[PDB]
C-alpha cells in the first residue's frame, strides 16, 4: 500500500511510448521505451517507487460523451484502475474537473500537419474551404478544443470535422498516414509535429500555435503520489534534464 507498485496506464505514441525492438518476445515493463518511459524511470529512481505499465484497452486519451461519461486513460484514472497515466496527456480545464495532473513536463500547442505542396498558411485558410479535408484524433484534447471553441474560425472547423466521418482519426498514426495518402491536414500537437516533420520530409507544420499548454502525468483526483512526482519534475527541469531527454528522443537526421 505504502510499498505497492503503482499501476501506470499508457498508450503507444512515438516518441513518447513505443515497443522497443528485440528478437525475443518481450513482456512486462521491458516492452516499453521512449521519452515518457525515461521520465517514468527517472521519477521512480528519485522517489523510490516501482510500477507496472499497462496499455489502455480502448487506445484513447479521453473525452466525455453527451451523458458525461469519460473514456480512454482519463476514465482509467477516474475509476482508480490506474495510479498514473504516463503519456503525452494534455492538461485541460475539462479534464481538471475530473482528474488531476502533475505539473507540466512539456509545453505544446495545437498546430497543423500537412504535406508540402499547396501553400496554405493558417487555420483560417483551412476553415474557408473543404477541398483539403482536415481533422483531429478522436476523443483527444485537440478534438475537444475545437468542439468547445467559440472562436468563429474554429467553430467553422468543428462544424466540418464533426460532419465528416473520415475526418476524426483513431490516433496520430492514422492521421499521419492520412496526410500522406489524401489531401488531408491533421490538427496535431506541436512537439509531435516537430518529431514527425524531421522524419517525414514531405510533411510540414502549417502556421503557428493556436494555443500553449502542457502535458502532465495524470492521476486520480486526490492521489497521494501526485505531489512528490510534481516536485521531482520541477527539480529535473531546474537542471535542464527534461530538455536533454527531449533532445535524446527527438534527435535525428534532418531533411534535404
Ligand X SMILES: N[C@@H](CCC(=O)O)C(=O)O
Closest approach of Cβ 159 to ligand X, in Å? Answer: 19
Contact status: 247 vs its own copies (CB under 8 A):
no
CA 183 vs CA 38, 115, 133, 175, 177: distances in Å: 36, 8, 6, 12, 11
Query: Which residue has the closest beta carbon to Cl ion?
Result: 242
Question: Dihedrals φ, ψ of 169, to 5°?
Answer: -105, 165
Look at residue 199 and give the partner it binds from its own copies, ligand X, Cl ion, none, a contact being a CB closer than 5 to 8 Å depending on partner kind.
Answer: none
Complex with Cl ion: residue 29 or 200, whichever CB lies closer: 29
Comparison of 107 and 152: residue with beta carbon closer to Cl ion? 107
**Which set of grid coordinates corresponds to residue 110?**
495545437
Classify 143 as helix, strand or coil.
helix
Q: In the Cβ-directed half-sphere of 125, how many Cα atoms lie within 13 Å?
A: 13
Is there a binding annotation on residue 90? yes
Contact residue for K ion among 20, 41, 47, 50 (CB under 5 A):
50
141 annotated as belonging to a binding site for a ligand:
yes
67 forms part of the interface with its own copies (CB under 8 A): no
Interface residues with ligand X (CB under 6 A) are 61, 88-90, 136-137, 140-142, 188-189
| DSSP track, 201-253 | TTEEEES--S--EEEEEEEETT-SSHHHHHHHHHHHHHTTHHHHHHHHHH---
Q: Are 249 and 38 in contact (CB under 8 A)?
A: yes
- CB nearer to ligand X: pick between 49 and 146: 146
Which residue ranges make up the annotated binding site? Answer: 88, 90, 95, 141-142, 189
Specify binding-site residues for L-glutamate: 88, 90, 95, 141-142, 189
Amino acid at each position: 500500500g505504502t510499498n505497492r507498485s503503482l499501476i501506470v496506464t499508457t498508450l503507444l505514441e512515438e516518441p513518447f511510448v513505443m515497443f522497443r525492438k528485440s528478437d525475443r518476445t518481450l513482456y512486462g515493463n521491458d516492452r516499453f521505451e521512449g521519452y515518457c518511459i525515461d521520465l517514468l524511470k527517472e521519477l521512480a529512481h528519485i522517489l523510490g517507487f516501482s510500477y507496472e505499465i499497462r496499455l489502455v484497452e480502448d487506445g484513447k486519451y479521453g473525452a466525455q460523451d453527451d451523458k458525461g461519461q469519460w473514456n480512454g486513460m482519463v476514465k482509467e484514472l477516474i475509476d482508480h484502475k490506474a495510479d498514473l497515466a504516463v503519456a503525452p496527456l494534455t492538461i485541460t480545464h475539462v479534464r481538471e474537473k475530473a482528474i488531476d495532473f502533475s505539473k507540466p513536463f512539456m509545453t505544446l500547442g495545437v498546430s497543423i500537419l500537412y504535406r508540402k505542396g499547396t501553400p496554405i498558411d493558417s487555420a483560417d485558410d483551412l476553415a474557408k474551404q473543404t477541398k483539403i479535408e482536415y481533422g483531429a484524433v478522436k476523443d483527444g484534447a485537440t478534438m475537444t478544443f475545437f468542439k468547445k471553441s467559440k472562436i468563429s474560425t474554429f467553430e467553422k472547423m468543428w462544424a466540418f470535422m464533426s460532419s465528416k466521418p473520415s475526418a476524426l482519426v483513431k490516433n496520430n498514426e492514422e492521421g499521419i498516414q492520412r496526410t500522406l495518402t489524401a489531401d488531408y491536414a491533421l490538427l496535431m500537437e506541436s512537439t509531435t509535429i516537430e518529431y514527425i516533420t524531421q522524419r517525414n520530409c514531405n510533411l510540414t507544420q502549417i502556421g503557428g500555435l493556436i494555443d500553449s499548454k502542457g502535458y502532465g502525468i495524470g492521476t486520480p483526483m486526490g492521489s497521494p503520489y501526485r505531489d512528490k512526482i510534481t516536485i521531482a519534475i520541477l527539480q529535473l527541469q531546474e537542471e535542464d534534464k527534461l530538455h536533454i531527454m527531449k533532445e535524446k528522443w527527438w534527435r535525428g537526421s534532418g531533411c534535404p
